[PDB]
Design a protein around this motif. Sequence first.
Motif, PDB file in Angstrom:
ATOM      1  N   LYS A  44      29.352  36.943  49.689  1.00 60.07           N
ATOM      2  CA  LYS A  44      28.117  37.563  50.167  1.00 60.07           C
ATOM      3  C   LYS A  44      26.891  37.036  49.422  1.00 60.07           C
ATOM      4  O   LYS A  44      25.830  36.815  50.020  1.00 60.07           O
ATOM      5  CB  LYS A  44      28.213  39.086  50.030  1.00 60.07           C
ATOM      6  CG  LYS A  44      26.920  39.835  50.332  1.00 60.07           C
ATOM      7  CD  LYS A  44      26.391  39.515  51.713  1.00 60.07           C
ATOM      8  CE  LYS A  44      25.345  40.523  52.159  1.00 60.07           C
ATOM      9  NZ  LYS A  44      24.809  40.176  53.505  1.00 60.07           N
ATOM     10  N   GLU A  45      27.016  36.815  48.119  1.00 58.86           N
ATOM     11  CA  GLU A  45      25.874  36.426  47.302  1.00 58.86           C
ATOM     12  C   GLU A  45      25.733  34.925  47.102  1.00 58.86           C
ATOM     13  O   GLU A  45      24.623  34.454  46.826  1.00 58.86           O
ATOM     14  CB  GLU A  45      25.973  37.059  45.913  1.00 58.86           C
ATOM     15  CG  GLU A  45      26.012  38.572  45.917  1.00 58.86           C
ATOM     16  CD  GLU A  45      24.658  39.166  45.602  1.00 58.86           C
ATOM     17  OE1 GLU A  45      23.957  39.588  46.545  1.00 58.86           O
ATOM     18  OE2 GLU A  45      24.286  39.191  44.408  1.00 58.86           O
ATOM     19  N   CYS A  46      26.819  34.167  47.158  1.00 58.18           N
ATOM     20  CA  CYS A  46      26.837  32.821  46.599  1.00 58.18           C
ATOM     21  C   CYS A  46      26.819  31.765  47.688  1.00 58.18           C
ATOM     22  O   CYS A  46      27.483  31.906  48.717  1.00 58.18           O
ATOM     23  CB  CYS A  46      28.063  32.588  45.719  1.00 58.18           C
ATOM     24  SG  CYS A  46      28.051  33.606  44.249  1.00 58.18           S
ATOM     25  N   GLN A  47      26.067  30.696  47.417  1.00 66.53           N
ATOM     26  CA  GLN A  47      25.978  29.553  48.316  1.00 66.53           C
ATOM     27  C   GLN A  47      27.169  28.629  48.143  1.00 66.53           C
ATOM     28  O   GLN A  47      27.597  27.981  49.100  1.00 66.53           O
ATOM     29  CB  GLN A  47      24.680  28.780  48.038  1.00 66.53           C
ATOM     30  CG  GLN A  47      23.443  29.442  48.648  1.00 66.53           C
ATOM     31  CD  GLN A  47      23.256  30.877  48.183  1.00 66.53           C
ATOM     32  OE1 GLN A  47      22.944  31.116  47.020  1.00 66.53           O
ATOM     33  NE2 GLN A  47      23.448  31.830  49.087  1.00 66.53           N
ATOM     34  N   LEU A  48      27.707  28.567  46.934  1.00 67.08           N
ATOM     35  CA  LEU A  48      28.929  27.839  46.635  1.00 67.08           C
ATOM     36  C   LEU A  48      29.916  28.805  46.003  1.00 67.08           C
ATOM     37  O   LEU A  48      29.594  29.441  44.999  1.00 67.08           O
ATOM     38  CB  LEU A  48      28.650  26.688  45.682  1.00 67.08           C
ATOM     39  CG  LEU A  48      29.894  25.901  45.295  1.00 67.08           C
ATOM     40  CD1 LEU A  48      30.465  25.208  46.500  1.00 67.08           C
ATOM     41  CD2 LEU A  48      29.484  24.892  44.241  1.00 67.08           C
ATOM     42  N   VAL A  49      31.113  28.901  46.578  1.00 71.13           N
ATOM     43  CA  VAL A  49      32.104  29.896  46.178  1.00 71.13           C
ATOM     44  C   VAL A  49      33.252  29.200  45.458  1.00 71.13           C
ATOM     45  O   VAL A  49      33.851  28.258  45.993  1.00 71.13           O
ATOM     46  CB  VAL A  49      32.607  30.692  47.387  1.00 71.13           C
ATOM     47  CG1 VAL A  49      33.794  31.573  46.989  1.00 71.13           C
ATOM     48  CG2 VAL A  49      31.478  31.515  47.970  1.00 71.13           C
ATOM     49  N   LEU A  50      33.552  29.654  44.245  1.00 72.10           N
ATOM     50  CA  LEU A  50      34.706  29.191  43.484  1.00 72.10           C
ATOM     51  C   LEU A  50      35.672  30.354  43.293  1.00 72.10           C
ATOM     52  O   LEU A  50      35.247  31.486  43.042  1.00 72.10           O
ATOM     53  CB  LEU A  50      34.288  28.626  42.124  1.00 72.10           C
ATOM     54  CG  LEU A  50      33.147  27.610  42.075  1.00 72.10           C
ATOM     55  CD1 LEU A  50      33.118  26.941  40.708  1.00 72.10           C
ATOM     56  CD2 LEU A  50      33.260  26.572  43.179  1.00 72.10           C
ATOM     57  N   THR A  51      36.974  30.082  43.406  1.00 71.73           N
ATOM     58  CA  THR A  51      37.965  31.149  43.412  1.00 71.73           C
ATOM     59  C   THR A  51      38.789  31.253  42.136  1.00 71.73           C
ATOM     60  O   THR A  51      39.575  32.197  42.014  1.00 71.73           O
ATOM     61  CB  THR A  51      38.913  30.993  44.609  1.00 71.73           C
ATOM     62  OG1 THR A  51      39.555  29.716  44.552  1.00 71.73           O
ATOM     63  CG2 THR A  51      38.142  31.110  45.914  1.00 71.73           C
ATOM     64  N   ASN A  52      38.638  30.322  41.190  1.00 68.34           N
ATOM     65  CA  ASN A  52      39.282  30.421  39.883  1.00 68.34           C
ATOM     66  C   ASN A  52      39.135  31.841  39.341  1.00 68.34           C
ATOM     67  O   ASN A  52      38.057  32.444  39.454  1.00 68.34           O
ATOM     68  CB  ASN A  52      38.684  29.401  38.912  1.00 68.34           C
ATOM     69  CG  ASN A  52      39.330  29.445  37.540  1.00 68.34           C
ATOM     70  OD1 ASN A  52      39.067  30.347  36.744  1.00 68.34           O
ATOM     71  ND2 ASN A  52      40.170  28.454  37.247  1.00 68.34           N
ATOM     72  N   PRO A  53      40.198  32.419  38.783  1.00 68.30           N
ATOM     73  CA  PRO A  53      40.125  33.828  38.363  1.00 68.30           C
ATOM     74  C   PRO A  53      39.108  34.094  37.272  1.00 68.30           C
ATOM     75  O   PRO A  53      38.672  35.241  37.127  1.00 68.30           O
ATOM     76  CB  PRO A  53      41.554  34.128  37.883  1.00 68.30           C
ATOM     77  CG  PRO A  53      42.167  32.785  37.613  1.00 68.30           C
ATOM     78  CD  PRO A  53      41.548  31.857  38.609  1.00 68.30           C
ATOM     79  N   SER A  54      38.717  33.084  36.502  1.00 67.57           N
ATOM     80  CA  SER A  54      37.757  33.278  35.426  1.00 67.57           C
ATOM     81  C   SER A  54      36.312  33.287  35.908  1.00 67.57           C
ATOM     82  O   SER A  54      35.415  33.531  35.094  1.00 67.57           O
ATOM     83  CB  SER A  54      37.929  32.190  34.365  1.00 67.57           C
ATOM     84  OG  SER A  54      36.981  32.349  33.327  1.00 67.57           O
ATOM     85  N   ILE A  55      36.070  33.050  37.198  1.00 67.37           N
ATOM     86  CA  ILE A  55      34.712  32.873  37.717  1.00 67.37           C
ATOM     87  C   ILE A  55      34.117  34.226  38.074  1.00 67.37           C
ATOM     88  O   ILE A  55      34.762  35.063  38.719  1.00 67.37           O
ATOM     89  CB  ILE A  55      34.708  31.936  38.938  1.00 67.37           C
ATOM     90  CG1 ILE A  55      35.214  30.545  38.551  1.00 67.37           C
ATOM     91  CG2 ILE A  55      33.324  31.857  39.558  1.00 67.37           C
ATOM     92  CD1 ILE A  55      34.318  29.832  37.598  1.00 67.37           C
ATOM     93  N   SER A  56      32.866  34.428  37.675  1.00 61.92           N
ATOM     94  CA  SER A  56      32.179  35.682  37.913  1.00 61.92           C
ATOM     95  C   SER A  56      31.675  35.771  39.353  1.00 61.92           C
ATOM     96  O   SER A  56      31.487  34.766  40.040  1.00 61.92           O
ATOM     97  CB  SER A  56      31.019  35.839  36.929  1.00 61.92           C
ATOM     98  OG  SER A  56      31.508  36.188  35.639  1.00 61.92           O
ATOM     99  N   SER A  57      31.450  37.016  39.790  1.00 64.55           N
ATOM    100  CA  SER A  57      30.933  37.289  41.128  1.00 64.55           C
ATOM    101  C   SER A  57      29.702  36.443  41.433  1.00 64.55           C
ATOM    102  O   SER A  57      29.647  35.728  42.444  1.00 64.55           O
ATOM    103  CB  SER A  57      30.616  38.782  41.239  1.00 64.55           C
ATOM    104  OG  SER A  57      30.068  39.104  42.497  1.00 64.55           O
TER     105      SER A  57
END
Length: 120
Positions: A44-57
């Motif tokens: 919803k917020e991000c233009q580029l989405v990373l799914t690594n578990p350490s990545i913040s919202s």
Amino acid sequence: SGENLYFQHMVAPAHLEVNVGGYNTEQTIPIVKHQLVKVGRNDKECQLVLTNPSISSVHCVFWCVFFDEDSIPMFYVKDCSLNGTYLNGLLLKRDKTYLLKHCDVIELSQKKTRLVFMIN
């Protein structure tokens, strides 16, 4: 809103090259005036989405400001994350605004995704 953002592409002043495992994917994310580019896990917020578990919202954000009658561009990054964002291998201070330079490499604490900042 859409037409206005379209016309800011009328070359973007800078862009992020998306780099995975050391190699560009060919995807670029333009950095244009009056837009905040967010990178993180939250689509919803991000233009580029990373799914690594350490990545913040919302992990880090990019934007630019043109000073002095639209003549001097400054480009900024800010870490918003829990686990950190690196700039050329160096840990940013959380919530502090940092000025970017051509070819700077942004690594989100997480092969890995890196963002290569390029001025046009």
